[PDB]
Amino acid sequence: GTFTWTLSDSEGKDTPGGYCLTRWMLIEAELKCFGNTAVAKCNEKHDEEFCDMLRLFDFNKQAIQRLKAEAQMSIQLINKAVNALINDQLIMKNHLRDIMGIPYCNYSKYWYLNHTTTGRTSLPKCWLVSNGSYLNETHFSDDIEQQADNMITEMLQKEYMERQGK
Amino acid sequence: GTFTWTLSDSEGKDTPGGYCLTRWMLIEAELKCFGNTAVAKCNEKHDEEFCDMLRLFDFNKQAIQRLKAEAQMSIQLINKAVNALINDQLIMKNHLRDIMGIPYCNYSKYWYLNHTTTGRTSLPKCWLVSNGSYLNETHFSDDIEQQADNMITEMLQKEYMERQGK
Amino acid sequence: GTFTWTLSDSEGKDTPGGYCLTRWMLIEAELKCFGNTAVAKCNEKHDEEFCDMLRLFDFNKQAIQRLKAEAQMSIQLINKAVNALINDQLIMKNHLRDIMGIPYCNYSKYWYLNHTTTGRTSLPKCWLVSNGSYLNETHFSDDIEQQADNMITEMLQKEYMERQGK
Amino acid sequence: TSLYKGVYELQTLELNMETLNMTMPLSCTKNNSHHYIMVGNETGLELTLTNTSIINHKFCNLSDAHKKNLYDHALMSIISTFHLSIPNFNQYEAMSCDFNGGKISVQYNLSHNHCGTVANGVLQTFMRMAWGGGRGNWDCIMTSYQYLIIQNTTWEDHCQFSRPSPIGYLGLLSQRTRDIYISRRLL
Amino acid sequence: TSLYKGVYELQTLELNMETLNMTMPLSCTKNNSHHYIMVGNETGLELTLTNTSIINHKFCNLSDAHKKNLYDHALMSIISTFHLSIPNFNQYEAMSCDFNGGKISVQYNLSHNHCGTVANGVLQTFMRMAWGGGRGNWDCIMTSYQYLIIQNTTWEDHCQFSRPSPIGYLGLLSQRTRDIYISRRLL
Amino acid sequence: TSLYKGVYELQTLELNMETLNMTMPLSCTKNNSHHYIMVGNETGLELTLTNTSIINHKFCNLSDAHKKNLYDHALMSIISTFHLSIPNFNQYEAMSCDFNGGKISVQYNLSHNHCGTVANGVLQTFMRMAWGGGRGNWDCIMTSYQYLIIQNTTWEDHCQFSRPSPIGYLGLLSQRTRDIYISRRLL
Numbered sequence A, B, C: 001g002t003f004t005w006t007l008s009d010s011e012g013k014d015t016p017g018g019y020c021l022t023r024w025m026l027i028e029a030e031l032k033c034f035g036n037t038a039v040a041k042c043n044e045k046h047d048e049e050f051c052d053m054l055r056l057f058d059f060n061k062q063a064i065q066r067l068k069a070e071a072q073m074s075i076q077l078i079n080k081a082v083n084a085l086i087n088d089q090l091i092m093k094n095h096l097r098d099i100m101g102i103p104y105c106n107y108s109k110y111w112y113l114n115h116t117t118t119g120r121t122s123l124p125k126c127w128l129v130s131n132g133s134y135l136n137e138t139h140f141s142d143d144i145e146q147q148a149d150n151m152i153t154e155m156l157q158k159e160y161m162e163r164q165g166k
Numbered sequence D, E, F: 001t002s003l004y005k006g007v008y009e010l011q012t013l014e015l016n017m018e019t020l021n022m023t024m025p026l027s028c029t030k031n032n033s034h035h036y037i038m039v040g041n042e043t044g045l046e047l048t049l050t051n052t053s054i055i056n057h058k059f060c061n062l063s064d065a066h067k068k069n070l071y072d073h074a075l076m077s078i079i080s081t082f083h084l085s086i087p088n089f090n091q092y093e094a095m096s097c098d099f100n101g102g103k104i105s106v107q108y109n110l111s112h113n114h115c116g117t118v119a120n121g122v123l124q125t126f127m128r129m130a131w132g133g134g135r136g137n138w139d140c141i142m143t144s145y146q147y148l149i150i151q152n153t154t155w156e157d158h159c160q161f162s163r164p165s166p167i168g169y170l171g172l173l174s175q176r177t178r179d180i181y182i183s184r185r186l187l
């Protein structure tokens, strides 16, 4: 089947329908809130590693808060929820890329663009690794350029439809 | 994988590409026909319980009509067709919501909006339960408002595109 | 889960982001290149048999090129990659159609439209079989007409958005 | 009577899933302890939580029963799915059976952290199969009953507490063998 | 030669799936009774419906074959998948095998409602594996043949009735263990 | 500091998977040979590739371990998943165990085409479970180590080479029983 977990409402009001990663969920120990536009892609895309990690973290928090946590772990719970939470085939694709010598995602690190003035960002994409090290930025700068193009085209189309409606 | 069953053509001509629930399929023993627009969402969406029940009922009818039915059951047939008909993860999500004390869908009851004048409707959504009873309407009236907004926006955009095409 | 295999870049420059079937992959032993528009549908659709065959052929080629091929077969490799490559429920759907006497796809033959002047085409769809023979064209001419209608509507909408942007 | 946006009347429907009886099993709940799964309009299985055991031996002669081939194949399939869905089952003496004459009788002994017990796994499977409506850590379940008994029965209007529904069985189909233990090196 | 909407020419293509031979098995049909699954360009399995049995004992010495480890691993994998895909198999004498010297010989005895029989399940699995193109209730299959024999073979042009295709094997991969019965309490 | 389209600043984040520790196991790699899977903050399994064996018998008394019911259920679940994920395992002598007192000790003998061997399957599963970063044909793996040893351990900061992550275990969950052989006709 397909994943189904709905993300819980973001604590931060800056992103009304987005999602926030607290200081504990990040290595840089800071808070990063992503807006509704980026988080909405997570409901329909099937190949976004970041949206699978978001679903994992959200499931973890909700389980810790609504169920009585004990030190002994209920392996059963994650065993039953896994396919409702993540696409295991995404994992298989990263494994296949790894064994063929193609750069692959190890779910650790993600990059995104930030439109400084406005604060909108893009949906983070996995920073690929190869030969035991992270790819240099110049090796995938084309994808970054593409993401910028997408953020432009989609914003322009929204403004067009707005102008039309008014 | 993903569900694949195509709904068979609606008997009622009022909804050319929609679907009709006969008197037997409903508790109120009446006929309810939904139009092509609402039923088309069932081909692309993955989290609509109602579209899974539609696929189940359609499979049942087609199996009874094209195969020689006998009282002894071919459990094997549904065993092989199940994942082609429904998303089992939707079921798992409702189970997880149940065990965490969150209101959940038990697939019995559905609500939808009806634009009286025209007869057009929205795709029915499951009526959630909590504490052994159906949720009171006031508890999810915000979702009803959201559905109404969606019905307005999509219609407006279609008229815009129409004006554009002409 | 859902399929994840990204198609490798097309050799032919005529279709920058499309895909090419070489003389070996086809019975008529010629080269057919499909454009980016048709091949892009394969990233989001779940019920296109042709896109599953494309993923199979691309996996075959990449495996033959990046792994040291030997005559003894690594059954395990395809066993693990299968669900990352194809929707097995599509297969189940065709089996169910077969046993119920409905015309079904046996993945051999596909038809598509060609806009002669420009050379742009539509995404090939499976030519169904029934009672051991291919369906006569007149039996599914409505679908061909529908495909033509779609190719018009979508092109006109793109032209509209273009006009809007300029 | 309940108008939204001025022009949208709120209307409802309820599906009669009972009509699916011929193509898929239908489960329902009579009360907290008693549940049923009917297969077609003729036969089915009643699952009861009870202090009163009906089997007082340690046998479950599944292979000989297969040899004789007198049971209902659909009911045996349902039994197999149920048992294969139990997480971490590792006490074979807790399960006893009687299959003589093609009958189906299965008895789980639930008598005794309470989470890593046969009682919890069996009760979770039972809760999932009917899904018709004490508390333990995480997803853990506990009851005061000593036995769960599964016996074949004829059709009767048993659905007093919840409507018949195929959802529980269909959902349990994916649970099969997901949490079984290895008992030898060559399966 | 067939023009639609005045500007759209209808054209066709047919895929040569034979080229997938090195990375996945390919099944094809010679006629109603005879089918083949080749693995690469050197070896494969021929499955024949026939009235002439080749095994006249009740043994299937799978564990000794595993210990000796002389067979082709891909063929053993395919045999395992086929057998694990049969629904409701419960008559172990109906299956006989010979594995001496690393060879593969498997014989299903189809002789005898007709739906709840080993013959029906075996025949449904056989229909699914090649999918190369009397009638029972629901999905039930019956033939007049007394045996289904599966033996290894070398590559040859066997595909007179249906083109080689990987679809059947891949589709059967998901059927594994889906309809197996429990034979003991602790798997 | 890197600016795209003159208005888009490139920024990064890295997730701390360690916080998932209470609801799913976390695997990590110390070096090429040593890997760990932690369950909660108190226990886990250490998997070591080594030339020094710790078991010198041919027993693996799984059923007695189950009946005594002294082991940690999560660890036994992980062990079962690992073993069921091995492709084409057909040499029961290659795996020995010790479960006395509820401890978990599992030893795979890797000594000896190298592809169709227990060593290859075991090593592929080991590489998949931690996924922490000789060469064979296709997906084939070979090492110079004679043993793979899996023993219970207490929590310690072992993740010097790779960060803790749940991805390997979750990925292996779907591999279970996918490539097992049939050992008898009635599973």
Ligand SMILES: *[C@@H]1O[C@H](CO)[C@@H](O[C@@H]2O[C@H](CO)[C@@H](O[C@@H]3O[C@H](CO)[C@@H](O)[C@H](O[C@H]4O[C@H](CO)[C@@H](O)[C@H](O)[C@@H]4O)[C@@H]3O)[C@H](O)[C@H]2NC(C)=O)[C@H](O)[C@H]1NC(C)=O
Pocket: B106, B107, B108, B129, B132, B133, B134, D131, D132, D157, D158, D159, D160, D161, D162, D163, D164, D165
């Ligand atoms: C989803 O959840 C809802 C809400 O919890 C749940 O609805 C309940 O269904 C039961 C079963 O249908 C209803 O109980 C009925 O109530 C009345 C009054 O007691 C009677 O009509 C019924 O008894 C008669 O009918 C039965 C059915 O034929 C006979 O077996 C019996 O002998 C009697 O003739 C029955 O007790 C209950 O009222 C509702 N609750 C609400 C709030 O509406 C629904 O069943 C759940 N669905 C699923 C599929 O789980």
Ligand SMILES: *[C@@H]1O[C@H](CO)[C@@H](O[C@@H]2O[C@H](CO)[C@@H](O[C@@H]3O[C@H](CO)[C@@H](O)[C@H](O[C@H]4O[C@H](CO)[C@@H](O)[C@H](O)[C@@H]4O)[C@@H]3O)[C@H](O)[C@H]2NC(C)=O)[C@H](O)[C@H]1NC(C)=O
Pocket: C106, C107, C108, C129, C132, C133, C134, E131, E132, E133, E157, E158, E159, E160, E161, E162, E163, E164, E165
């Ligand atoms: C999908 O369904 C279609 C339609 O049912 C089906 O097409 C059929 O394929 C078979 C096998 O290729 C064709 O049979 C061939 O017909 C001619 C005339 O007899 C001969 O060329 C062939 O025999 C020669 O070639 C074979 C292949 O090399 C050799 O094995 C043989 O010794 C001969 O040299 C062969 O008999 C049949 O004509 C078509 N039918 C139609 C209507 O086109 C197709 O195979 C199905 N595909 C799958 C994957 O199931």
Ligand SMILES: *[C@@H]1O[C@H](CO)[C@@H](O[C@@H]2O[C@H](CO)[C@@H](O[C@@H]3O[C@H](CO)[C@@H](O)[C@H](O[C@H]4O[C@H](CO)[C@@H](O)[C@H](O)[C@@H]4O)[C@@H]3O)[C@H](O)[C@H]2NC(C)=O)[C@H](O)[C@H]1NC(C)=O
Pocket: A106, A107, A108, A129, A132, A133, A134, F131, F132, F157, F158, F159, F160, F161, F162, F163, F164, F165
């Ligand atoms: C995804 O791939 C990347 C790139 O390969 C990989 O990043 C590597 O992670 C390891 C483990 O965190 C890093 O190694 C660390 O490096 C420094 C310098 O040696 C030290 O801080 C670390 O050792 C200390 O901390 C450890 C953890 O607490 C302790 O166990 C240890 O005793 C020390 O106190 C450690 O060696 C390595 O530098 C990076 N590599 C790069 C290029 O950044 C990442 O782990 C991969 N993620 C997954 C989930 O697989």
Ligand SMILES: *[C@@H]1O[C@H](CO)[C@@H](O[C@@H]2O[C@H](CO)[C@@H](O[C@@H]3O[C@H](CO)[C@@H](O)[C@H](O)[C@@H]3O)[C@H](O)[C@H]2NC(C)=O)[C@H](O)[C@H]1NC(C)=O
Pocket: B024, B064, B069, D018, D019, D020, D021, D022, D041
């Ligand atoms: C189990 O489900 C089956 C299939 O839906 C139900 O059988 C169906 O029952 C209905 C209602 O009685 C029948 O419809 C009626 O049929 C005739 C004309 O065919 C006539 O009396 C009425 O006009 C009405 O259409 C329907 O034919 C019948 N289907 C079959 C295949 O027999 C059955 O009622 C369900 N059982 C239970 C216990 O709910």
Ligand SMILES: *[C@@H]1O[C@H](CO)[C@@H](O[C@@H]2O[C@H](CO)[C@@H](O[C@@H]3O[C@H](CO)[C@@H](O)[C@H](O)[C@@H]3O)[C@H](O)[C@H]2NC(C)=O)[C@H](O)[C@H]1NC(C)=O
Pocket: D053, D055, D056, D057, D109, D110, D111, D112
């Ligand atoms: C369901 O399981 C329970 C728990 O195992 C069974 O009760 C147990 O019965 C056994 C005998 O079969 C008792 O063991 C004996 O007890 C006394 C000493 O306590 C003595 O006679 C023997 O030395 C032996 O140890 C055991 O105590 C008892 N456990 C209880 C009561 O908690 C029960 O019989 C099972 N039900 C069925 C129907 O089999």
Ligand SMILES: *[C@@H]1O[C@H](CO)[C@@H](O[C@@H]2O[C@H](CO)[C@@H](O[C@@H]3O[C@H](CO)[C@@H](O)[C@H](O)[C@@H]3O)[C@H](O)[C@H]2NC(C)=O)[C@H](O)[C@H]1NC(C)=O
Pocket: C024, C064, C069, E018, E019, E020, E021, E022, E041
């Ligand atoms: C089984 O499948 C393999 C792999 O697809 C087939 O081998 C392939 O055969 C083609 C056609 O003969 C080879 O292409 C040719 O190769 C050389 C140059 O490399 C030259 O003769 C031609 O210009 C042409 O490109 C292809 O290389 C070869 N692939 C491999 C990996 O060896 C084989 O034909 C199939 N066998 C059967 C019985 O169908």
Ligand SMILES: *[C@@H]1O[C@H](CO)[C@@H](O[C@@H]2O[C@H](CO)[C@@H](O[C@@H]3O[C@H](CO)[C@@H](O)[C@H](O)[C@@H]3O)[C@H](O)[C@H]2NC(C)=O)[C@H](O)[C@H]1NC(C)=O
Pocket: E053, E055, E056, E057, E109, E110, E111, E112
């Ligand atoms: C495939 O299975 C069939 C059906 O079971 C086998 O035929 C059966 O052969 C047995 C002996 O192995 C026959 O039983 C004996 O029959 C007579 C009385 O009918 C008598 O000699 C003994 O008391 C015993 O009951 C059985 O009748 C017969 N069934 C038939 C013919 O329908 C067949 O041998 C199997 N094929 C192979 C190759 O093993």
Ligand SMILES: *[C@@H]1O[C@H](CO)[C@@H](O[C@@H]2O[C@H](CO)[C@@H](O[C@@H]3O[C@H](CO)[C@@H](O)[C@H](O)[C@@H]3O)[C@H](O)[C@H]2NC(C)=O)[C@H](O)[C@H]1NC(C)=O
Pocket: F053, F055, F056, F057, F109, F110, F111, F112
């Ligand atoms: C791990 O597996 C290896 C490989 O099987 C084991 O080494 C093998 O040990 C056996 C005895 O258990 C040796 O067989 C004997 O060898 C000589 C003649 O070569 C003679 O004493 C007997 O007739 C018998 O055949 C076998 O040669 C040897 N294989 C090697 C060294 O490659 C090893 O014992 C296993 N380790 C553990 C800890 O279980």
Ligand SMILES: *[C@@H]1O[C@H](CO[C@@H]2O[C@@H](C)[C@@H](O)[C@@H](O)[C@@H]2O)[C@@H](O[C@@H]2O[C@H](CO)[C@@H](O)[C@H](O)[C@H]2NC(C)=O)[C@H](O)[C@H]1NC(C)=O
Pocket: D051, D111, D144, D145, D146
């Ligand atoms: C069914 O019986 C249980 C108790 O069974 C007895 O105690 C077991 C520990 C074991 O020794 C069995 O063989 C015995 O027959 C009843 O449980 C009681 O429930 C009440 C109410 O919840 C609770 O206050 C008591 O403490 C429980 N007693 C024990 C000993 O646990 C249970 O109520 C009985 N159920 C019915 C429906 O009668």
Ligand SMILES: *[C@@H]1O[C@H](CO[C@@H]2O[C@@H](C)[C@@H](O)[C@@H](O)[C@@H]2O)[C@@H](O[C@@H]2O[C@H](CO)[C@@H](O)[C@H](O)[C@H]2NC(C)=O)[C@H](O)[C@H]1NC(C)=O
Pocket: F051, F111, F144, F145, F146
């Ligand atoms: C661990 O030992 C192996 C050798 O094991 C020996 O040979 C086996 C075939 C069997 O007979 C065992 O009982 C023996 O103890 C070491 O393998 C050597 O590795 C080096 C480096 O790669 C290589 O050059 C040698 O040819 C290998 N020798 C053989 C005989 O294969 C291996 O290195 C040892 N591992 C470590 C970490 O020290």
Ligand SMILES: O=C(O)[C@H]1O[C@@H](O[C@@H]2[C@@H](O)[C@@H](O)OC[C@H]2O)[C@H](O)[C@@H](O[C@H]2OC[C@@H](O)[C@H](O)[C@H]2O)[C@@H]1O
Pocket: D184, D185, D186, D187, E063, E064, F059, F060, F092
């Ligand atoms: O664990 C296994 O798969 C094999 O165990 C082997 O050793 C046995 C022990 O594990 C224990 O269960 O009981 C004592 C030992 O026999 C078995 O010998 C082996 O059984 C097969 O071996 C070949 C043949 O003699 C048997 O009939 C087979 O079942 C287990 O596969």
Ligand SMILES: O=C(O)[C@H]1O[C@@H](O[C@@H]2[C@@H](O)[C@@H](O)OC[C@H]2O)[C@H](O)[C@@H](O[C@H]2OC[C@@H](O)[C@H](O)[C@H]2O)[C@@H]1O
Pocket: D059, D060, D092, E184, E185, E186, E187, F063, F064
């Ligand atoms: O069904 C089971 O899993 C256990 O059955 C126990 O009882 C046997 C009966 O079920 C029947 O198969 O044959 C007669 C009885 O032996 C078995 O005793 C038990 O075997 C294990 O018990 C521990 C050890 O002695 C054995 O080697 C194990 O196989 C079954 O697990």
Ligand SMILES: O=C(O)[C@H]1O[C@@H](O[C@@H]2[C@@H](O)[C@@H](O)OC[C@H]2O)[C@H](O)[C@@H](O[C@H]2OC[C@@H](O)[C@H](O)[C@H]2O)[C@@H]1O
Pocket: D063, D064, E059, E060, E092, F184, F185, F186, F187
């Ligand atoms: O292969 C099987 O599933 C059955 O094999 C039957 O025949 C045995 C041979 O296969 C061989 O392993 O050893 C000689 C034969 O016994 C078994 O008899 C059967 O075991 C059941 O038989 C009845 C009872 O004694 C056993 O406990 C059952 O498990 C296998 O299922």
Ligand SMILES: *[C@@H]1O[C@H](CO)[C@@H](O)[C@H](O)[C@H]1NC(C)=O
Pocket: A032, A033, A034, A114, A115, A116, A119, A121, F011
């Ligand atoms: C984007 O930039 C703004 C302005 O500097 C900053 O406040 C915000 O945190 C950034 N967004 C993210 C997700 O880091």
Ligand SMILES: *[C@@H]1O[C@H](CO)[C@@H](O)[C@H](O)[C@H]1NC(C)=O
Pocket: B032, B033, B034, B114, B115, B116, B119, B120, B121, D011
């Ligand atoms: C919506 O309202 C119209 C007008 O009253 C009615 O005829 C129609 O049946 C309603 N639609 C549904 C699906 O109930």
Ligand SMILES: *[C@@H]1O[C@H](CO)[C@@H](O)[C@H](O)[C@H]1NC(C)=O
Pocket: C032, C033, C034, C114, C115, C116, C119, C120, C121, E011
């Ligand atoms: C479409 O027609 C053009 C013009 O004849 C031709 O070159 C091209 O190959 C055709 N496309 C396909 C996919 O066959």
